[PDB]
Amino acid sequence: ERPDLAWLDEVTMTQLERNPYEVYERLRAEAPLAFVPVLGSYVASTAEVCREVATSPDFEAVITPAGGRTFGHPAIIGVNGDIHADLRSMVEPALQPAEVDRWIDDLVRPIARRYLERFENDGHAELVAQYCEPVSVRSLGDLLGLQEVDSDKLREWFAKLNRSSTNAAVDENGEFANPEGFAEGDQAKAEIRAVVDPLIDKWIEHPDDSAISHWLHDGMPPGQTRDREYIYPTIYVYLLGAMQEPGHGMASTLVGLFSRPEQLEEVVDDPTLIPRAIAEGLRWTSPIWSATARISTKPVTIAGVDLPAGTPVMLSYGSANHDTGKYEAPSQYDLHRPPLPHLAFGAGNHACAGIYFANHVMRIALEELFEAIPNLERDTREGVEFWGWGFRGPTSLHVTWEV
Ligand code: HEM
Ligand SMILES: COc1cccc(CO)c1O
């Protein structure tokens, strides 16, 4: 409907999944708030608009259409008011910085060592499948109480939930263009229920120190637990992004460092720079790229667009983190960029609840990797492909080292 943006009618979902940065570079210049037809939604592409929408008192959280189809209600990302406050109070205890500092090292470092010892003498590895994803899912899985669920299964689940919740394409009538793409999300949820329902049965009667046991029991009257249907959508939210993103963030950081070999050497020589390297990695390729949204609660004007009440806006934080109003040459990974604010963890009342935990998981994993394989090199015979619009990360990362 906006005439000068008629080129957006020809943008495809495949194009956005393969590489969204060219389209979003145009959006940031032409229309920082723009209706993208294949997504069926307004999209915020600049840091200023994303931050305004994410923190505005005239917006509240809304789940994306494909996210709602995947997760249902009450997904912590899609609710507000009293339910959101309860769900935040439910998840926040184990994520509190003082609590994380008590046990994060004894959690992650032995896991990292376990996966490293499977390949650290091979001279070759595919780090996404062999290290970054396993460490990410095993760390969170143990925290949650899913010790018995193999890392391969956790990885499969987040992949299916990723594809289902980002199955956003709509057709000429605004209907989902690929409804069969939700089937694997439904199958993952069915498998998750089969594994987790017996665990919940047990935790209700025999609480333990697992996070999900605490979700059932914390803050409840004596002998009562939160209904499992009330907490399952947030379990699913964890089994997608909480499981996937630390691995994506570590992997993207490594790809970025490999692209700047002098900076890789600096970080290997001085591991106190790992946190800075990760923060630049998250800006450079944001793991949660465009997966959340807000909805206006009253008429509002944003970036010159008059929006009615009830208008959803997707928050494309991954684009905002390449805003050239803020960053010079943002498509280049640069460890020595000044430590400016970034939006890879979102903003506002629905900002990431697990930042401190996530940053430590990624730090410890990279510390142990560089200690075990100080002469790590990228295998330049193999290409690194990034994939994803909603969630983005490298699909593989082949490396080599002299043994
Ligand atoms: C590098 C890793 C991670 C990144 C980049 C990331 C990023 C994000 C982003 C962008 C959001 C949406 C915020 C918004 O809509 O403004 C979010 C939400 C959330 N994340 Fe993180 N996340 C990461 C890891 C984790 C982990 C490991 C956990 C749990 C242990 C977690 C828990 C949550 C929760 C509960 C929410 C929903 C907050 C709410 O809607 O109130 N995240 N995260
Ligand atoms: C913590 O996990 C998530 C954070 C933000 C969005 C989603 C799914 O859309 C997630 O699963």
Swiss-Prot record:
Gene Ontology MF terms: heme binding; iron ion binding; monooxygenase activity; oxidoreductase activity, acting on paired donors, with incorporation or reduction of molecular oxygen
Entry-linked InterPro entries: Cyt_P450, Cyt_P450_B, Cyt_P450_CS, Cyt_P450_sf
Keyword Heme found: yes
Protein name: Aromatic O-demethylase, cytochrome P450 subunit
Documented EC number(s): 1.14.14.-
Pathway the protein contributes to: Aromatic compound metabolism
GO process annotations (BP): catabolic process
Essential cofactor(s): heme b
Amino-acid positions noted as binding substrate in the UniProt annotation, renumbered to this chain: V237, G241
Catalytic activity: guaiacol + reduced [NADH--hemoprotein reductase] + O2 = oxidized [NADH--hemoprotein reductase] + catechol + formaldehyde + H2O + H(+); 3-methoxycatechol + reduced [NADH--hemoprotein reductase] + O2 = 1,2,3-trihydroxybenzene + oxidized [NADH--hemoprotein reductase] + formaldehyde + H2O + H(+); anisole + reduced [NADH--hemoprotein reductase] + O2 = oxidized [NADH--hemoprotein reductase] + phenol + formaldehyde + H2O + H(+); guaethol + reduced [NADH--hemoprotein reductase] + O2 = oxidized [NADH--hemoprotein reductase] + catechol + acetaldehyde + H2O + H(+)
Residues that, per the record, bind heme: H84, R88, R294, Y317, A347, H350, C352
Keyword annotations: Aromatic hydrocarbons catabolism, Heme, Iron, Metal-binding, Monooxygenase, Oxidoreductase
Family: Belongs to the cytochrome P450 family.
Domain of life: Bacteria
Protein's UniProt keywords contain Iron: yes
Subunit structure: Monomer. Forms a heterodimer with GcoB.
Function: Part of a two-component P450 system that efficiently O-demethylates diverse aromatic substrates such as guaiacol and a wide variety of lignin-derived monomers. Is likely involved in lignin degradation, allowing Amycolatopsis sp. ATCC 39116 to catabolize plant biomass. GcoA binds and processes the substrate with electrons supplied by the GcoB subunit.
Pfam families listed in its UniProt record: p450 (PF00067)
